[PDB]
Amino acid sequence: KLDSHLKELRDFMYPEGNTLMLTTPELSGEFHQLGSQLEKLNHITVEILG
Amino acid sequence: KEVQATVMDWWEQPVQLCLPSEERGGLTLRQWRERWTVAVTALQRATGSRS
DSSP: OHHHHHHHHHHHHOTTSSSOOOSOHHHHHHHHHHHHHHHHHHHHHHHHHO | OHHHHHHHHHHHOGGGGSOTTOEETTEEHHHHHHHHHHHHHHHHHHTOOOO
């Protein structure tokens, strides 16, 4: 039982087997994408004001 | 991109070239602009004021 509990919790926390994951990978990917798109929008804005 | 287009329209004012055959004082707008450009250029040459 102890071995099973340990294996289940570990599988959940280490989805890619090597790294403890605190954020949902799907969410982490979206944050990065949103940050990149905002940086582009800020360039276009600066360029037009200039 | 749309805002950039608006900025462009404000700077070029394209509506001034829409009636070419219209004469006022015996000359067209273009002719008047040309007269203006020659005069502005002559003034700028006299007034040493190198633009």
